[PDB]
Amino acid sequence: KNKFLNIAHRGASGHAPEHTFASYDLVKKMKADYLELDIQLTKDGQLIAMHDTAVDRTTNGTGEVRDKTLSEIKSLDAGSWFNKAYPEKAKQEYVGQKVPTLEEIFQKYGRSMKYYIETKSPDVYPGMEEKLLALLEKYNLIGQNMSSSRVMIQSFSKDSLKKIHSINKNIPLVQLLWYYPNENNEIVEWSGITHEPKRVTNDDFQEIKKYAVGIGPNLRNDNGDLIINESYMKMARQNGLLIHPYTINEKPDMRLLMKWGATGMFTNYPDRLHTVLKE
Ligand SMILES: [Mg+2]
Helix, strand or coil: CCCCEEEEECCCCCCCCCCCHHHHCCCCCCCCCEEEEEEEECCCCCEEECCCCECCCCCCCCCEHHHCCHHHHHCCCCCHHHHHHCCCCCCHHHCCCCCCEHHHHHHHHHHHCEEEEEECCCCCCCCHHHHHHHHHHHCCCCCCCCCCCCEEEEECCHHHHHHHHHHCCCCCEEEECCEEECCCCCEEECCCCCCCHHHCCHHHHHHHHCCCCEEECECECCCCCECCCHHHHHHHHHCCCEECCECCCCHHHHHHHHHHCCCEEEECCHHHHHHHHHC
């Protein structure tokens, strides 16, 4: 029920290129509980795994996913950038890694893996949620009960989650949150879904609880500064929410969130977290 979830952020993306099979093939090995997936929709309506809406940062191509067919996506090198960015981790095998489709991921792992899948605002990729729920259904990844689910769905978009919650009550949903300092150096939540972390209210969390089983807050801001506190975790737990902070790659930050009462973590290093869980 409150069992700790080791969530491999884009696979073991600290060891191999994110959202490639090179990265996904390490997750089971490194004892992760969930494989975290970001999805985009190609021009011919196929779901693929990629974080950005543009292919630029992680491939040798340029342009938006939505303007590209699955065929064009598939000729891109989605692995060489990693060898360049991280010379000390480079591998020849990473060269030429193709962008995975969500169906391919499901066909390869089936039920040996649990999936933690992110959606976007309904207006970004019209019909994405329905295509996603049909795919999940095709591979029997949705149980008819909430407890035996092989899938959680996560999103920054409350609208996207309320949509899914209306279609199927049996999928656990997680409300992602992003806290940052604004132009007046006041901390605000991106979507306006809660107060700043120091001042969250029961009501903030009870509202989330109407459609979601948990929250996923950023632990730090872009500067590297701590932005949530123990108080905040205590208030979310007391309202019966799971809490999955991102993106935790450092052992001391892992040990702190354990103590503060996180019930899961996004990490690029599922091996490090497993090790910290064993201490
Ligand atoms: Mg994500």
